[PDB]
Amino acid sequence: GQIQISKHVKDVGLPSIHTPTKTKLQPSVFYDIFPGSKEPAVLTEKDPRLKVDFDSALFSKYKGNTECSLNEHIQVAVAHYSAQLATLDIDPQPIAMEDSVFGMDGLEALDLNTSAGYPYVTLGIKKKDLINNKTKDISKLKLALDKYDVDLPMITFLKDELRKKDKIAAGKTRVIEASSINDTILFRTVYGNLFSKFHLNPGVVTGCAVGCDPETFWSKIPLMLDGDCIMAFDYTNYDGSIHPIWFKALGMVLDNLSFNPTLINRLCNSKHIFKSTYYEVEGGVPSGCSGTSIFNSMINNIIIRTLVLDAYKHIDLDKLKIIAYGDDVIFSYKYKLDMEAIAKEGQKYGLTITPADKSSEFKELDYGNVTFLKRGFRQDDKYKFLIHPTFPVEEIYESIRWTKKPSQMQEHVLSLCHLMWHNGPEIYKDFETKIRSVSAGRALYIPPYELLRHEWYEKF
Numbered sequence: 001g002q003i004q005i006s007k008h009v010k011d012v013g014l015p016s017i018h019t020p021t022k023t024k025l026q027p028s029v030f031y032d033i034f035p036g037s038k039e040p041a042v043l044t045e046k047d048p049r050l051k052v053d054f055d056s057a058l059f060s061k062y063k064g065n066t067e068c069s070l071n072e073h074i075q076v077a078v079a080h081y082s083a084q085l086a087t088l089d090i091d092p093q094p095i096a097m098e099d100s101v102f103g104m105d106g107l108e109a110l111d112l113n114t115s116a117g118y119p120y121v122t123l124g125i126k127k128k129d130l131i132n133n134k135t136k137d138i139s140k141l142k143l144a145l146d147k148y149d150v151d152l153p154m155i156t157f158l159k160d161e162l163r164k165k166d167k168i169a170a171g172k173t174r175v176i177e178a179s180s181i182n183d184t185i186l187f188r189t190v191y192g193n194l195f196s197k198f199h200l201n202p203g204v205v206t207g208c209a210v211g212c213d214p215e216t217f218w219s220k221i222p223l224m225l226d227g228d229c230i231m232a233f234d235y236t237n238y239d240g241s242i243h244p245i246w247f248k249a250l251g252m253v254l255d256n257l258s259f260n261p262t263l264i265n266r267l268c269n270s271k272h273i274f275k276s277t278y279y280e281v282e283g284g285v286p287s288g289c290s291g292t293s294i295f296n297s298m299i300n301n302i303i304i305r306t307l308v309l310d311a312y313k314h315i316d317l318d319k320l321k322i323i324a325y326g327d328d329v330i331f332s333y334k335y336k337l338d339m340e341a342i343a344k345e346g347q348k349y350g351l352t353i354t355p356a357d358k359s360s361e362f363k364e365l366d367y368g369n370v371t372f373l374k375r376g377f378r379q380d381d382k383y384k385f386l387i388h389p390t391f392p393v394e395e396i397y398e399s400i401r402w403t404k405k406p407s408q409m410q411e412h413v414l415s416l417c418h419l420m421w422h423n424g425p426e427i428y429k430d431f432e433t434k435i436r437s438v439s440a441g442r443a444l445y446i447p448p449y450e451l452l453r454h455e456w457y458e459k460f
């Protein structure tokens with residue numbers, strides 16, 4: 001990520017975007033019932049919990065781009081992965097706008113709650129003002145499309161969420177570049193079929209997990225990654241470390257499929273508006289963007305193949321199975337491979353790869369300690385072939401202590417329970433007890449472990 005130009009919105013003819021300065025998160029009635037350290041992320045330069053300057057650390061993700069071009073290995077990576085995707089027979093033609101908005105098979109309907117982005121956010125216009133899902137009317141949407149066109153700047157929002165104390169004093173708050181609904185629609189009409197195909201085919205052919213249901217997909221992973229092992233690792237600032245060449249490679253893949261190879265460049269050479277500053281970035285991917293999960297996974301698919309070929313000879317790509325969800329990736333090879341060595345091949349590209357789960361060194365992993373989409377793996381008691389997706393109990397305790405909407409505690413709780421029960425009867429029972437220890441939690445409906453277990457078996 002290299003900031004090319006930065007200037008006042010007034011000197012460019014753009015409005016100043018107003019962003020929430022204070023968190024909506026507040027202590028819930030369970031705050032004292034469960035243990036936790038996390039707290040609301042810093043949303044303003046003036047937060048006593050700070051140590052370093054806000055704007056400083058905030059815009060530190062942009063280290064710039066490392067000098068490097070396309071090599072034969074990347075070309076080979078692109079070639080193999082393309083051939084893999086070619087087996088899915090994806091239709092290159094665009095999709096009707098009616099499908100881009102209300103969805104189709106494999107493509108969820110557009111979220112009508114999130115902001116419409118620029119410039120609607122500055123005109124008081126929301127998505128439900130352009131789309132009438134009630135009568136499926138989108139006439140007003142079409143007008144807006146032709147009125148403001150496309151390739152509009154992205155709005156930078158600070159991510160109001162829970163973070164560890166060290167991220168609080170360090171002012172490390174995550175940003176969420178919000179694309180204009182106009183560009184979300186364009187990207188869906190163009191790539192819609194690809195997005196659809198991927199969502200219906202999470203696995204090793206697409207090398208992607210976007211669209212999967214962890215509850216059933218977890219049982220499949222072990223069968224797909226049928227290798228001599230299983231590897232995972234962490235990325236230090238993945239989004240801001242994606243060098244432009246990966247987009248060039250992504251384009252080639254898309255071109256081998258007969259899709260637009262240039263549109264995606266609007267993500268590489270992106271336009272942004274933080275608050276009163278307008279700027280353009282060269283390199284990196286827009287964090288939290290609308291439809292970038294799939295593109296990020298594809299890039300990772302190209303990266304993994306490259307680093308492997310870079311670190312080893314006599315490698316058989318067909319034997320390297322990959323499953324990615326954006327920057328999160330797990331893969332395997334017929335034979336054992338050194339993760340540390342693979343990691344070092346990333347340095348030349350500007351990718352900082354560290355041990356999985358913020359570990360000390362690059363230690364060997366197994367389905368016993370490996371994680372993916374922040375979930376571990378645990379065999380079911382009754383049926384050993386079914387795999388429980390385990391979510392960190394600590395994270396659940398952390399989440400339940402805060403709430404953004406008090407009158408929605410029932411919904412919040414239910415979500416947690418669906419994650420929780422996968423950790424076991426004893427743990428779930430203790431969770432239920434703590435909740436029901438206060439009148440407010442007693443009035444809540446908590447799904448019994450038997451009911452959750454029963455419903456889970458019927459999903460296979």
Ligand SMILES: C[N+](C)(CCCS(=O)(=O)[O-])Cc1ccccc1
Binds near residue numbers: 378
């Ligand atoms: C994926 N397996 C089929 C074999 C993995 C052997 S290992 O425990 O050494 O990673 C089953 C499995 C084993 C433990 C946990 C979750 C799944």
